[model samples]
Target: SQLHKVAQRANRMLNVLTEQVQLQKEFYQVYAKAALAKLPLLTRANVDYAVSEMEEKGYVFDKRPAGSSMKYAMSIQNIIDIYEHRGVPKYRDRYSEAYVIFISNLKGGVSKTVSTVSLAHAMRAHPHLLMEDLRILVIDLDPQSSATMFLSHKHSIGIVNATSAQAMLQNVSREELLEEFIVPSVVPGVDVMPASIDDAFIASDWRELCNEHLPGQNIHAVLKENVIDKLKSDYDFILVDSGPHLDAFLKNALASANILFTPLPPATVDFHSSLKYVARLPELVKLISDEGCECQLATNIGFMSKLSNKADHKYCHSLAKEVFGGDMLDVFLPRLDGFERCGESFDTVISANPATYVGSADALKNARIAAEDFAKAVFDRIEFIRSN
Candidate 1:
């Protein structure tokens, strides 16, 4: 009868999350979460720790034996209840306090979007690590809209008229901007402000319109302040994925960020170009602020993304290490077909099944280690910002 009462409690709570008939189809809603898409596998310690905590609450599970294999079972609802009880901290109506990171590089095809998605995934993935609930918003400022494309598949789920371009296509007051664009991704805890090709044309017109109305001002900061300030308290982190190239939209992306991250893809050309772009960032920030735009910009920290394990890269990486020193992130993601496979399947690496890369296990494993390192950086930055 001890478990009977607890089972009754669980049965009562299950309906708060899942539907009645829906329960039979998918036993557990399982996959890598979009928030933690690119992360490494959870360590046994964490998993064992989670099981112990649930056991303390009278929740129980058992691993069924399979010859030379291991399996464990637990209710999906039970996991949610455990996390909800963890009481992750959240902020409300404090826009100025939001952590904004801009993902950019002056060149394309270098996994810039991947970096943004991965960073957001790691931050939102480990709620128990921080013991605080965090809400995250990813802003696709790229007119190319690759991040939008990756996320919009889920964004279009429930309602019609789901494109992020709606916010840009018309002239709207600052009050009504974000709600028009920000929409939910299929990922539970993540949301996105999507974009499209139309955003390219809209940015120019909006630039002229802003110039005419807010003369002698940094239009980007003005643009940033209007919508971001309104939505700040709504998220713990707001990540901006900027397109490669200079434009008004890029300016706004920079203005919105308190911290900027540039992905330096391996290749002599990318190394040169990304380094130049990052070097110019401070100068650009100064220029924008000098023009009366309240741009809160900072120096960029670079990450070696899509790197290769080739002999040539060793020298290049060493040079990069010498050049960037502490400004470069310690994590370096190698070139892998796993990411390409995820793209082919219209999913991110986090959402893709490990079975999808049967022969490419090495690639997946290497990328996972890099992602874990990257996740550490995200947490480190959060602590750094909070402390100083």
Candidate 2:
């Protein structure tokens, strides 16, 4: 009876947290008039007038109540509409298929989920980036479902049905079953295939299920053959957020991705662990090749996340450059309280308004700049890969 009571208390606490997250989502608004000016079509001279005209055409706007010079608030959907009405060309047509970017590391707490969600938001909302008709599908492969909650604003505590696991276990083709599980996210052009605690079972059960369902196929390639390949044409980018463990799900992600981006924090233990993880890649690649599956990653990228200005941080960063060399991304995400604040509030630094953010104005601005830089670097790589 005592254990039952403890479980009940934990469930109640989780429910309360879920309710608070929902409330935060409801109140959070992106008032990014300054960001709107970064659009090539809209200059500073006409951005305000364009917003006013759009407001007159039934587009919603909110004014900051207090001491901020930023006045107008607009959602990402409003910006998308502006680009549509002005006939902005689609970026998706330039590529033959959706660019699959997998964010993963064997080490935990390296800001993998943060990078995945924030990059998705920046790619969609950043005015300097390709925001016109860009569709992003975030497949949450982590049992914790952090990216799912960040993008969809939904908690996956007890969700047993309609997840990636269910889609995989069904007798029907996953292409057919997977479509039913994909849901629209809170972000304007982003969709999500959420994960749940039940997905953890996939690691143990996937081999048996694969033998039974598709006897002759490579088990590691099931996710790509069944899920990503079928849906790639529908979106411009498909981002897979993987858990830290090396399992069947991570194998599937590795098999499915065009680029494997790892976030390496510049710390003593984290650097060692990340290098060990990197050292294991060739062995993992061999394992996949033994299955007669092609594990060809166009690019393997590692970048520093949660970096501070400490001497030890710089030392670790220098070591990383020596170790990774050309594999390391030049752009790194600096440590900022705003990231943690947005994570607590179930928001992204790219989409959260400075006036409404719980953190300081400068913190939000810096975080946004960091996110934009990261997005730009990744976008440049994607363009390079697509061109080749």
Candidate 3:
């Protein structure tokens, strides 16, 4: 009964959890005072613990050290402002460091999902991270919704309680958008905007919505404009996991990225295929931005696993030098068996099972190397990529 009641209450109180976690803290105290007219429950020991639990959850806290049992709620803005003043400095100015990493390519089975989810785990593991400001908003624009499946543990595609229809239908403005669609993930500092499995067939919902609106300006930027624009100052970075195809979703993503991380197969053919998709990126980007997209963005194309094709690898690197030297990332995510299973659960290979990570001393070393390189590259890139 507690489970059923809490589920119903949680779904309702979920509104308060999102909007006024801080206010709830203070309200609890006021309610206790009102209830105490007949019976005092606030002084109860178990109630004290319940209050204490919510306090550390970043919702409410007793300001007076002596009044350990005193309770109150917190404003998301309260926590946000504390970080904005102190947190931004630590994250090296989140205003300038709104990082957007997209794991994408025209070719499928290139470990896009793994790269997207694993990197989320890696970023959270970093000591330098600000857990509150490190927002990993995964926009599942793909119809497959594999990334969504990995996250919410749901198999069937339905209306994304958050923004499924809107993501496919509306742009930045106008929608009876629900907050629960974007949820706090199991991983701290990571928030996921999941998708339904049937996102493919439901694409027409967006088409049916508007005809009077401007074509380019009206569409695109729904995810970024809705989710990121408000929290951009709060988030140090964002990661978008796109489907294999390059169409509206792809354009929308490119338009929102402050840094676009394109993942492609290491083979020459796949490398060329990815290049063809992006060759006209500048044109497509301007087209969308001129319409309504306004998010800072760039790129560092990395080669995915199955590195056995030495010749293709060489060509891929050569092409990077020729096409993305200034743009492409210097680092690459290796083909590791550990990463292949990253999706069975949202837990990355390193995160899913830390103890058995890599399984051997040698394999572990490789994992560490890749992790260190990635961290260092992003650190330097943060400084290097700043258009200043």
Candidate 4:
């Protein structure tokens, strides 16, 4: 039985199969096939054609109904043979080797934590990350602590309990800081300087620190000089998930960031909340634009998430698109029921039990594609910064 199962696994990597597949497994199979055949399997897009073909052929054979999920395994060797000459997704260093991305918005419930974790996973999955000596670090700066929670559950490696708030609020040197605060996340090649439950008291603690340490000076500026700047060379990319509210926490997050990603739900109410952020951009700029402060307005990119295709939602999305125009991203995160409630269990679709995902096989299949689209979009945006 074991031999049979293992053989199927090997076969799945070689060719298109009828089985429904996840992104990670499918891509790995492609790479294996490429390795054996001396061919190329460069990026996620390269895998899509194989996926589409399998579904179509399976439907034709009556092994699956029309539009039903494919349910068999194919060989990796065959996949690479089919698409070994497509464009490669080689990583090119754009600017300085390091990047700091702030994932934030004025509003909550826009899949902020999900986007941060998923983006890191996708980035980690990049074929070149392992080839080069590069890694990504995710900084969970939100005081609500949802992002940290999702990362810390049922992990084989067990994420450590070092919190960013404690590091920032404490009187510590740069050398001492990195060892104490930054720790590895459960995701491979993705580390996190986590946020803790105690971070909820950060505002009060920061206020008292300001009064005692450096009254009437910019506290936001102090953080950038002390923590973020010192850790620039240690990782290739640094991602920060800021709290929804525009306060000391967000100010500190923005202070260290070079780019910003704001997730917008395609609803009239969510669109209104996003406008409020634009109104407050000047206030953020004023505080951090003082001399020697690295904090300035982030190259703001707005993306739509939790998007539905219903008529009303479609209209609101169009309106928001016009309002945002060039500032908006082309990728959209769909409103999948399977993904909506995974946070309570301290999991994401990427991290959760795939067998237990709520949607039907076809629905979940679509969800994975949507997620891949978003991840690729993020890579494009960040790489754009590198080129310019």
Q: Please name the candidate that would achieve the greatest TM-score relative to the true structure.
A: 2
List the RMSD of every prediction in angstroms. 13.5, 4.9, 13.5, 14.4
lDDT of 3 by residue, 1-388 (tens): 8899889987887666545533432111112312212322222454345445545767553243326765334222333333343324445333554667776667787777766665675565443343233555666777777666665434222334445434444434322232545655545566567775556554544444434343543557655665556555545667777677655667667766767666656777777777876676676667777876564665545544445447778677676667766656677777654444444344444345445443454554466456545654665676666646
Tell me which of candidates 1 and 4 scores higher on lDDT.
Answer: 4
TM per candidate comes to 0.72, 0.82, 0.64, 0.71
Better of 1 and 4 by TM-score: 1
Task: Extract clashing residue pairs from model 1.
Answer: 35-121, 37-350, 88-132, 88-133, 89-132, 89-133
Strongest candidate by lDDT = 2
Error of 1 at 58 (Å): 12
Every candidate's lDDT = 0.62, 0.78, 0.55, 0.64
TM-score of 3: 0.64
1-388: candidate 4 lDDT, tens digit per residue: 9999999987876444323232223122223322332322344454456555654766221122235765334333233224432332223232344677777887888788888877776566433233233477777777677777766553421322457766665646766766777655555556777776567777657778776766665677655655677777667777888678766778887887788887878787877887788668767767666643656555888888888887878986887688679878988888875456565566655545456655465654565556666777887887776567
| Candidate 1 Cα misplacement greater than 4 A, ranges | 1-96, 126-130, 154-180, 211-218, 355-369
Deviation of model 2 at 196, angstroms: 0.7
